[PDB]
Amino acid sequence: GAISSVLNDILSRLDKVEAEVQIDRLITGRLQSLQTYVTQQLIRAAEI
Amino acid sequence: VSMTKTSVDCTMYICGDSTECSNLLLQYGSFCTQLNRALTGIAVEQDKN
Amino acid sequence: VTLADAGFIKQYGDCLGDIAARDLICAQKFNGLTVLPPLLTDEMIAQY
Amino acid sequence: QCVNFTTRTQLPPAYTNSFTRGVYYPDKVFRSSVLHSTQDLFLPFFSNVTWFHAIKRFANPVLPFNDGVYFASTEKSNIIRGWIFGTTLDSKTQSLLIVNNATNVVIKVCEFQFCNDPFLGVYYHKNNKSWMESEFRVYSSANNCTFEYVSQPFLMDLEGKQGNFKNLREFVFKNIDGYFKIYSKHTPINLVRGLPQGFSALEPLVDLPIGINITRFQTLHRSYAGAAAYYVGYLQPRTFLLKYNENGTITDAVDCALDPLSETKCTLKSFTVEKGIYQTSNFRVQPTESIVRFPNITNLCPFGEVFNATRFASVYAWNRKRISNCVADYSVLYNSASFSTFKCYGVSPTKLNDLCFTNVYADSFVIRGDEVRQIAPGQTGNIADYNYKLPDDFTGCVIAWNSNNLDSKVGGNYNYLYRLFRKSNLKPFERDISTEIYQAGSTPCNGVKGFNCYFPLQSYGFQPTYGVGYQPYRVVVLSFELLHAPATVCGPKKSTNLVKNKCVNFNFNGLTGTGVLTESNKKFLPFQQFGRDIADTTDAVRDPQTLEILDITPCSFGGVSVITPGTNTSNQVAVLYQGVNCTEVPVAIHADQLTPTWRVYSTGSNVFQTRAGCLIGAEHVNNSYECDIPIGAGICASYQT
Amino acid sequence: CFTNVYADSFVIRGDEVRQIAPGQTGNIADYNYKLPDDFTGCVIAWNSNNLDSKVGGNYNYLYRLFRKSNLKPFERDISTEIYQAGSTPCNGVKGFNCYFPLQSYGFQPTYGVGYQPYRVVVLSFELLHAPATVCGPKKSTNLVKNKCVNFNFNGLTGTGVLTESNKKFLPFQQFGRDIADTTDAVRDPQTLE
Ligand SMILES: *[C@@H]1O[C@H](CO)[C@@H](O[C@@H]2O[C@H](CO)[C@@H](O[C@H]3O[C@H](CO)[C@@H](O)[C@H](O)[C@@H]3O)[C@H](O)[C@H]2NC(C)=O)[C@H](O)[C@H]1NC(C)=O
Ligand SMILES: *[C@@H]1O[C@H](CO)[C@@H](O[C@@H]2O[C@H](CO)[C@@H](O[C@H]3O[C@H](CO)[C@@H](O)[C@H](O)[C@@H]3O)[C@H](O)[C@H]2NC(C)=O)[C@H](O)[C@H]1NC(C)=O
Ligand SMILES: *[C@@H]1O[C@H](CO)[C@@H](O[C@@H]2O[C@H](CO)[C@@H](O[C@H]3O[C@H](CO)[C@@H](O)[C@H](O)[C@@H]3O)[C@H](O)[C@H]2NC(C)=O)[C@H](O)[C@H]1NC(C)=O
Ligand SMILES: *[C@@H]1O[C@H](CO)[C@@H](O[C@@H]2O[C@H](CO)[C@@H](O)[C@H](O)[C@H]2NC(C)=O)[C@H](O)[C@H]1NC(C)=O
Ligand SMILES: *[C@@H]1O[C@H](CO)[C@@H](O[C@@H]2O[C@H](CO)[C@@H](O)[C@H](O)[C@H]2NC(C)=O)[C@H](O)[C@H]1NC(C)=O
Ligand SMILES: *[C@@H]1O[C@H](CO)[C@@H](O)[C@H](O)[C@H]1NC(C)=O
Ligand SMILES: *[C@@H]1O[C@H](CO)[C@@H](O)[C@H](O)[C@H]1NC(C)=O
Ligand SMILES: *[C@@H]1O[C@H](CO)[C@@H](O)[C@H](O)[C@H]1NC(C)=O
Ligand SMILES: *[C@@H]1O[C@H](CO)[C@@H](O)[C@H](O)[C@H]1NC(C)=O
Ligand SMILES: *[C@@H]1O[C@H](CO)[C@@H](O)[C@H](O)[C@H]1NC(C)=O
Ligand SMILES: *[C@@H]1O[C@H](CO)[C@@H](O)[C@H](O)[C@H]1NC(C)=O
Numbered sequence: 001g002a003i004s005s006v007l008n009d010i011l012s013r014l015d016k017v018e019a020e021v022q023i024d025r026l027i028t029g030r031l032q033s034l035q036t037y038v039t040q041q042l043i044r045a046a047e048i
Numbered sequence: 049v050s051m052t053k054t055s056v057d058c059t060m061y062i063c064g065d066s067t068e069c070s071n072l073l074l075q076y077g078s079f080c081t082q083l084n085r086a087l088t089g090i091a092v093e094q095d096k097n
Numbered sequence: 098v099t100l101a102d103a104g105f106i107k108q109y110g111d112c113l114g115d116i117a118a119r120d121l122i123c124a125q126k127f128n129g130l131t132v133l134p135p136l137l138t139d140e141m142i143a144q145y
Numbered sequence: 146q147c148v149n150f151t152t153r154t155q156l157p158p159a160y161t162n163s164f165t166r167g168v169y170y171p172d173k174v175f176r177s178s179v180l181h182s183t184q185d186l187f188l189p190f191f192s193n194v195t196w197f198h199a200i201k202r203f204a205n206p207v208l209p210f211n212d213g214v215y216f217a218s219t220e221k222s223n224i225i226r227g228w229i230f231g232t233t234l235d236s237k238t239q240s241l242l243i244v245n246n247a248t249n250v251v252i253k254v255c256e257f258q259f260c261n262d263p264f265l266g267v268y269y270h271k272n273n274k275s276w277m278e279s280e281f282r283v284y285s286s287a288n289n290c291t292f293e294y295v296s297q298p299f300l301m302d303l304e305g306k307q308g309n310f311k312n313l314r315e316f317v318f319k320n321i322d323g324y325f326k327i328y329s330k331h332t333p334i335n336l337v338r339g340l341p342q343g344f345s346a347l348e349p350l351v352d353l354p355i356g357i358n359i360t361r362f363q364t365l366h367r368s369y370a371g372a373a374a375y376y377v378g379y380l381q382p383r384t385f386l387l388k389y390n391e392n393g394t395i396t397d398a399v400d401c402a403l404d405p406l407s408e409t410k411c412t413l414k415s416f417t418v419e420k421g422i423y424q425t426s427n428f429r430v431q432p433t434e435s436i437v438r439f440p441n442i443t444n445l446c447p448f449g450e451v452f453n454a455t456r457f458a459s460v461y462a463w464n465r466k467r468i469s470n471c472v473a474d475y476s477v478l479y480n481s482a483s484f485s486t487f488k489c490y491g492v493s494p495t496k497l498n499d500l501c502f503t504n505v506y507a508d509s510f511v512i513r514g515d516e517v518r519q520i521a522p523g524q525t526g527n528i529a530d531y532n533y534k535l536p537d538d539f540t541g542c543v544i545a546w547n548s549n550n551l552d553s554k555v556g557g558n559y560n561y562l563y564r565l566f567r568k569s570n571l572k573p574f575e576r577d578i579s580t581e582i583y584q585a586g587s588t589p590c591n592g593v594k595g596f597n598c599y600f601p602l603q604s605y606g607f608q609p610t611y612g613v614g615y616q617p618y619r620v621v622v623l624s625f626e627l628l629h630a631p632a633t634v635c636g637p638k639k640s641t642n643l644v645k646n647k648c649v650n651f652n653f654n655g656l657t658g659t660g661v662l663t664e665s666n667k668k669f670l671p672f673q674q675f676g677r678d679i680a681d682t683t684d685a686v687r688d689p690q691t692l693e694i695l696d697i698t699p700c701s702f703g704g705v706s707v708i709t710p711g712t713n714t715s716n717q718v719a720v721l722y723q724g725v726n727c728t729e730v731p732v733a734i735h736a737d738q739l740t741p742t743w744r745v746y747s748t749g750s751n752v753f754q755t756r757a758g759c760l761i762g763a764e765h766v767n768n769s770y771e772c773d774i775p776i777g778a779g780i781c782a783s784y785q786t
Numbered sequence: 787c788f789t790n791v792y793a794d795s796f797v798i799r800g801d802e803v804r805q806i807a808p809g810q811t812g813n814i815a816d817y818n819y820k821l822p823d824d825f826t827g828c829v830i831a832w833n834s835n836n837l838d839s840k841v842g843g844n845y846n847y848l849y850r851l852f853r854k855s856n857l858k859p860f861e862r863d864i865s866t867e868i869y870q871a872g873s874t875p876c877n878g879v880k881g882f883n884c885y886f887p888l889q890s891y892g893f894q895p896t897y898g899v900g901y902q903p904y905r906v907v908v909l910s911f912e913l914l915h916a917p918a919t920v921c922g923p924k925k926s927t928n929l930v931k932n933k934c935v936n937f938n939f940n941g942l943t944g945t946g947v948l949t950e951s952n953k954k955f956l957p958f959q960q961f962g963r964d965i966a967d968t969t970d971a972v973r974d975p976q977t978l979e
Contacts, residue, residue: 003491005681007066009628012500012657015493016068016823017809023072030062031079038086041054045090048051048097052102053133055704055723057427060129064682065429065659065699088424095136095775105756105778108726113663113698117684124679127699129427131724134757134778141779173789173916175955175962175971239864256864289864322822323860349958354792356862392954393962480813482801495811 002026053091058083104134147260147282153204161340163194163378167215168385168398169317169328169347177393180414182401186319186380188215190400190407194340198374199224199366204262207234208377210362213319215378219334221308223300224373226265229283229363230320234259236288241325241355244365247278250299254292254355257284266368283365292355303331308371310335317347318362319380325353340376346395386411402742405707406718420711422774422782428722429702431738432659435650436643439501439635440689446471446634448478451507457552457619461532461564461602462578463510468623474498474637484546485618486517491540492627500655501632502625508533508574509621511552511561513605515614517545520622532564536573540627545620549609552617557606561617565603574624628656631674631687640690648700653686658697665696701729705741708763708774710784717784719763720746721776727752727759755780787921787940788911794819795907797838797847799891801900803831806908817850822859827910834905835895843892847903851889860910914942917960918975926976939972950979 002022004010010022058080063069073080102122112123122132137145167188188194194215197205210230218225223245231240236258243252246265266280303312310333319326328347336342364375384401401411409423410416446468458464475497479487487494512520512528519526522539529535535543552558566583579601582590586597594600607617625634632654645662652658656675667676669687676685676694685696704723709715722730730752735744746761753765757777773783798806798814805812808825815821821829838844852869865887870876872883880886893903918940931948938944942961953962955973962971973979 006683007064007069008657011066011068012655013492013496013627015495015809018493019068020072023069027062027069027072027076031073031076034056034058034061034083035079037056038083041090042086044051045093048049048094050135053104053135055131055133055424057129057131057704060427060702064128084424091133104724106726106758107724109698109701113696115666117696117698118667121679126724127678128680128682131704133723136772136775136777136779136781138756138779170956170958173958173960175953175959177953177962179965237865237867291862291864323858323862348956352790354860356860358858358861358863482799 001029050094050097053094055087055091056083102132104132147285148262148264150262150264151202151204153206154202157197157203158206159196159198161194161196161376163188163190163192163215163340163376164342165190165344165398166217166315166340167317167347167378167380168345168387168395170349170395171385171387173349175393176389178391179389180416181387181389182384182411182414183387184382184384186213186321187383187385187400188317188378189381189383190398190403192378195377196340196374197377199372203366205364205366207361207363209379210318210320210359211379212382213317213321213380214362215380216316216318216364216375217340217378218314218373218375219336219340220312220314220373222371222373223302224367224371225314225375226365226367228365229259229263230318230325230357230359230361231257232358232360234361234363236286239289239291239357241357241359242283244283245299246281247298249295249297252292252294252353253287253290254357255287255290258286258288259284263363263365264368265365269369278367280368292353294353301331303333305333313341315345315347317380320355320357320359323354323356325355325359327351327353344395344397384411386414388416404718404743404745405705405720405741406709406712406716408741408743409707409709409718410712416712418709418712420709420714420774422706422708422721422776424704424706426741427702427704428733429740430648430700430733431740432648432650432700433737434644434647435641436652436662437638437641438643438651438653438689439638439640440633440654441640442470442472442633442635444471446473448473451509451621452478454509456560457509457511457548459560459562460510460512460528461562462576463508463533465576466507466509468505468507469633471634472637473502473634478544484544486545487542488521489542490522492542494542497542498636498638499652499657500627501635502627503630503632505623505625505634507621507623509619511548511617511619512563513614514547514616514618517618517620520545520620527565528563530570531567532571532577534571534573534575535622539573539624541622541624543620543622545618547613547616548619549607549611549616552619553607553609553611555608555610557608558617559604559606561607562602562604564601566599566601628654629675631672632689643688643691645695651697654689656683656686658683659700660697661700663696663698665694667694667696669694701725701732703758708760708776708782715784717762719782720761721755721758722761723758723777725758727754727761730759730761787918788913789916790919791909791911793907793909795905797834797891797903797905798849799900800831800833800902800904803904803906806831806906813851814849816856817853818857818863820857820859820861821908825910826912827908829906829908831904831906833899833902835893835897835902837905839893839895839897839903841894841896843894844903845890845892847891847893848888849891850887852885852887914940915961917958917973929974929977940975942969942972944969 002025010019059070063073117123171183171185227244229242232238234240236256239254239256241254260282263283267276267278269276271277313332313334315330317328327350329350330345330347332345334341386399386401387395388397390396399407399410402408408425409418412425451466479494516528519529520543522535523537583599583601584590585599590598648661650659665685667685674687675683678684683697685694687694703725706721706723708719730747733739733747751762751764753760755778763782772781775781802812802814805815806829808821808823868876869885869887871885876884934947936945951971953971960973961969964970
């Protein structure tokens with residue numbers, strides 16, 4: 001839901017107040033994407 | 049008997065070479081240390097296995 | 098068995114240039130995903 | 146009066162190792178029995194602290210104050226009376242004075258013309274048993290001022306009395322966010338000449354709202370058989386981990402980036418580290434400079450031909466002008482107070498000088514002032530519905546101002562019109578020129594008009610009597626698209642020489658990033674500006690001044706693990722740079738920067754390559770043993786004779 | 787309650803009142819009054835032509851137009867050094883493309899809104915994380931211990947039992963915090979226990 005996926009593109013085109021509203025998304029979406037990977041790897045590690 | 053050990057740099061993944069992103073990531077507290085601790089736990093266990 | 102990324106030193110000259118177009122583990126590495134080597138090598142496991 | 150006594154009197158600058166000084170309570174909050182981590186301006190542990198000593202005749206140098214200062218004096222009998230702070234110190238800029246005098250402290254902020262060799266001094270035993278501070282030869286004039294304080298004398302002559310020991314003052318000064326924070330501590334000390342081994346913390350003393358740029362400072366000796374010395378350290382932005390004991394006193398600390406062991410202590414959040422190997426904050430090479438590469442176009446873009454045109458098109462037939470092959474400067478638009486409204490989408494106007502544009506169209510028209518709201522994307526109303534729709538995902542700026550003072554006429558201006566009706570609401574960036582009669586009644590119709598068969602346009606008779614919201618507004622929309630294509634409009638930013646095979650902060654056309662550039666062999670077609678990775682990040686670029694294609698690679702980085710016996714067995718540690726052929730660690734010299742500030746280990750001979758990375762500060766031995774601490778790929782490490 | 791309060795007061799044109807908010811930009815914000823990115827406080831403004839706009843022009847109200855660098859948050863500059871807008875260095879009272887750095891408002895009551903003068907006040911406190919020095923009209927209650935109560939000290943509200951501690955807060959400390967960053971202890975503002 002950010003205006004771009006490229007982190008530097010968000011910074012190249014927005015001011016230090018409006019950028020954070022876009023960056024919080026990329027952070028919250030990426031952070032969720034890691035928590036899914038690590039949960040799936042702990043469950044695979046439990047099988048191995 | 050094992051699988052590939054992986055360490056994921058949670059700051060470089062989320063905020064790749066952005067300092068202003070890294071200052072926002074710090075607002076979420078320990079989650080990158082929890083992810084690093086979990087993947088280190090898996091990695092140490094592949095040698096134990 | 099086709100072992101993708103054993104972790105044995107990607108010394109940049111094998112990961113930039115012509116190979117970089119055809120090697121997905123260089124994109125993984127450049128995004129901070131690192132594959133670590135096993136403690137016991139494929140020789141030590143062969144000796145045991 | 147000011148006096149020209151002698152000179153600076155030789156070279157007094159000495160050096161010392163500031164062990165564990167300049168730690169202070171980071172916030173006005175109590176904590177106890179806790180390991181607390183804080184990021185602030187702090188004195189680094191084991192820093193190369195500067196030293197000055199009184200031995201006769203002497204003077205005090207003016208010193209930098211960059212990022213804030215730690216000041217201390219090893220003292221007896223009150224020679225150090227205060228400090229001067231500022232940036233020119235000569236009444237051209239206002240500056241700060243702190244002094245303790247025979248009545249009391251002063252803190253004052255003025256356009257001081259300080260003396261070149263400022264001094265204070267006392268006359269001994271002047272027939273009244275008192276010794277008296279007649280001299281205040283510190284400034285000639287204090288021409289204008291903005292802050293004053295006075296109260297009492299800050300002379301806490303401590304216990305033990307009469308100079309039985311030496312007395313250490315410590316101070317920390319942080320000019321941040323217009324507020325000059327002072328912290329301070331007093332302690333007895335008995336060291337003959339150095340700065341003392343041991344731990345102490347500074348309380349926050351006063352917070353002064355002085356509002357001045359301080360780049361330099363000086364201290365103030367008194368004058369008249371006693372002798373004294375002062376230390377100057379410089380703060381840096383760091384992370385510190387503080388051991389608050391059960392009384393809530395900072396009893397010990399770890400400087401989180403002093404050395405690899407201190408960084409493991411800061412990672413595990415403990416003063417003891419168990420025997421093992423620990424991953425810690427990952428290393429990266431910093432950029433050695435910047436590159437900027439915009440097209441070498443020079444002709445200024447035709448903004449006057451849009452914004453100061455003779456007559457604007459009518460909003461049913463809005464004029465589109467293409468701005469291309471030219472240099473813009475959006476600051477000379479945006480800082481012009483003449484614009485009543487200037488709002489942007491997908492960009493902020495402050496960035497329009499940092500960035501290039503694929504192609505640009507200016508759309509230009511006149512509308513009523515209360516309809517200016519209708520020009521923004523997603524809107525509804527006669528303009529937006531029937532004759533000028535922006536797309537739901539527009540990027541660009543809309544800019545508007547009233548033009549009664551140019552285009553409103555007492556006999557009525559009627560050359561400006563809009564469409565009243567349409568069969569269906571228009572697609573974004575459509576233009577409809579047709580004059581066909583609109584069938585508002587159920588019957589078909591023909592000819593010049595019918596009953597409930599309207600002429601489709603409706604006009605406005607702008608007259609300068611009309612109120613705000615009924616006046617004419619000249620409006621322009623700048624409608625660019627960004628970064629995904631070979632741009633030809635740019636800000637006034639000058640390009641640079643290019644450089645390759647080094648880490649650099651690059652910027653091509655406004656695509657900012659950090660990386661190492663290389664001569665690629667990718668065949669980009671003439672319509673392609675950037676090449677992308679599976680991760681949607683840019684991995685190659687066509688340079689906009691010499692038309693070759695450069696590969697972008699992130700410059701060297703990898704994991705750092707620290708190897709240790711238990712801290713109660715030893716403080717020696719070894720570093721594993723995992724994934725690295727470390728013939729680069731010689732390139733990791735601290736001439737340029739690296740993220741982990743420590744780099745002593747790179748000294749060599751104790752460097753060993755492994756399939757896991759390279760291991761530094763541990764010696765390779767041929768005889769095998771049980772695996773004590775596991776590195777990887779058959780290698781282990783251990784602590785032994 | 788507030789740690790300490792400062793009121794900032796000044797005059798600007800009404801259409802530049804938008805520049806006083808934090809993160810904003812323009813000839814006021816960039817060159818003479820910047821708020822910090824994390825400002826805590828209130829910005830308050832009103833037109834004052836009816837008190838200090840004058841038919842010949844008021845010219846006692848001035849604003850900086852040039853500076854080598856944009857000023858830091860809550861910085862103030864009194865300097866009158868000539869600004870080198872041209873490529874040459876220069877000296878004296880003026881030169882070609884060397885400007886006196888200030889430019890005056892001229893305020894006459896004929897001006898429209900946006901050009902009219904506004905008196906602006908900014909209140910700039912920091913809250914609760916330090917011993918407070920000035921606040922609201924709320925009357926204190928008596929105090930009670932060893933019972934559950936809805937407490938409120940200096941505006942730090944919460945619910946708990948209150949008890950005589952033996953923690954030694956230093957004179958600069960108002961609150962203790964737990965490992966969890968919750969308030970664990972408080973120094974009472976009427977009896978300093
Ligand atoms: C130490 O430095 C101080 C700052 O320069 C200096 O303070 C000055 O003290 C005198 C005497 O009190 C003041 O003079 C005024 O005192 C009261 C003010 O209400 C009036 O009754 C007097 O008529 C007179 O106006 C100065 O104004 C004051 N300066 C400032 C800036 O406050 C001390 O006197 C210095 N002490 C020594 C020993 O030098
Ligand atoms: C927190 O601050 C406390 C106050 O300074 C401090 O308590 C003090 O500790 C000393 C040493 O234990 C006590 O000295 C007495 O100890 C016994 C009698 O209890 C005797 O053998 C000694 O001769 C001597 O009389 C102090 O009496 C004691 N003060 C109080 C008020 O209890 C704590 O140790 C401090 N805690 C930390 C971790 O710093
Ligand atoms: C706080 O005071 C500082 C000292 O005056 C000031 O730093 C100065 O900034 C200017 C503008 O950049 C520098 O002038 C030079 O600018 C560049 C190099 O930075 C050159 O191309 C120019 O030819 C020119 O020589 C000063 O050299 C610089 N001084 C120092 C010691 O760094 C800050 O900008 C001031 N900040 C505020 C908020 O007032
Ligand atoms: C302190 O030294 C300065 C020189 O560094 C003196 O300034 C000079 O004063 C004479 C008049 O006495 C002038 O003719 C010179 O042109 C001045 N030179 C400069 C560089 O300004 C100053 O007068 C001395 N102070 C005292 C009290 O004698
Ligand atoms: C700084 O001090 C100077 C010198 O007193 C002040 O300049 C005077 O200002 C008044 C009022 O405008 C004039 O009548 C004088 O002729 C000025 N004198 C000189 C030598 O310029 C100046 O106003 C003060 N500035 C501040 C902001 O305090
Ligand atoms: C401190 O820095 C100076 C040069 O600035 C150097 O000569 C001196 O040896 C340094 N001292 C230490 C302990 O590194
Ligand atoms: C002694 O004190 C008085 C009163 O302050 C003063 O006038 C006199 O000058 C002092 N004596 C000397 C030698 O200064
Ligand atoms: C538009 O006209 C005004 C008044 O002549 C002038 O100040 C401004 O610089 C002009 N802008 C352009 C882009 O022509
Ligand atoms: C860039 O500048 C050089 C030197 O003036 C010139 O030869 C070259 O043609 C320019 N590049 C382009 C794209 O025109
Ligand atoms: C660590 O070493 C100290 C001596 O320096 C000893 O008293 C302590 O018991 C040791 N602890 C462990 C866990 O080895
Ligand atoms: C290990 O032994 C070999 C000979 O087998 C020798 O060349 C090498 O130098 C030895 N290793 C070290 C660390 O000296």
